[PDB]
């Protein structure tokens, strides 16, 4: 038996989703940190 054939990957979809989610988290993060630093000073 002898069967010739090819494959191709289709990755790349959902990247902006991630890029945008990182941006979101990075920002939420920095802002959260400042809140901590701000409250630690109080307590």
């Amino acid at each position: 038996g002898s069967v010739s054939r090819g494959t191709q990957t289709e990755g790349g979809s959902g990247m902006k989703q991630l890029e945008d989610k990182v941006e979101e988290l990075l920002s939420k993060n920095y802002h959260l940190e400042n809140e901590v630093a701000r409250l630690k000073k109080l307590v």
């Binding site: 038996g1 002898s2 069967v3 054939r5 090819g6 494959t7 191709q8 990957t9 990755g11």
Partner: protein, 87 residues
């Protein structure tokens, strides 16, 4: 978390699941594709006789020749896995 999607197969159902299991075991052991790739090729050489080949990755294409009922191409998560017999 990384669910199995078979894109193409010319293989028995038992063997198809068995590939999907191997792939899963291999991916618990090794992070590096080259090593997942070897884990599987080796296991199939043992169970089902030589000569198997196996390519694991995310951004590749191929053209190959296989034996009847000895070919599978499937994704385990966002990672593609080509496995087949020739030799």
């Amino acid at each position: 978390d990384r669910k199995a999607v078979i894109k193409n197969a010319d293989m028995s159902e038992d063997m198809q699941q068995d590939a999907v299991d191997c792939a899963t075991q291999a991916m618990e052991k090794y992070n590096i594709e080259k090593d997942i790739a070897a884990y599987i090729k080796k296991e199939f050489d043992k169970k089902y006789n030589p000569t198997w080949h196996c390519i694991v990755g995310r951004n590749f294409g191929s053209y190959v020749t296989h034996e009847t009922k000895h070919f599978i191409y499937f994704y385990l998560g966002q990672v593609a896995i080509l496995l087949f017999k020739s030799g």
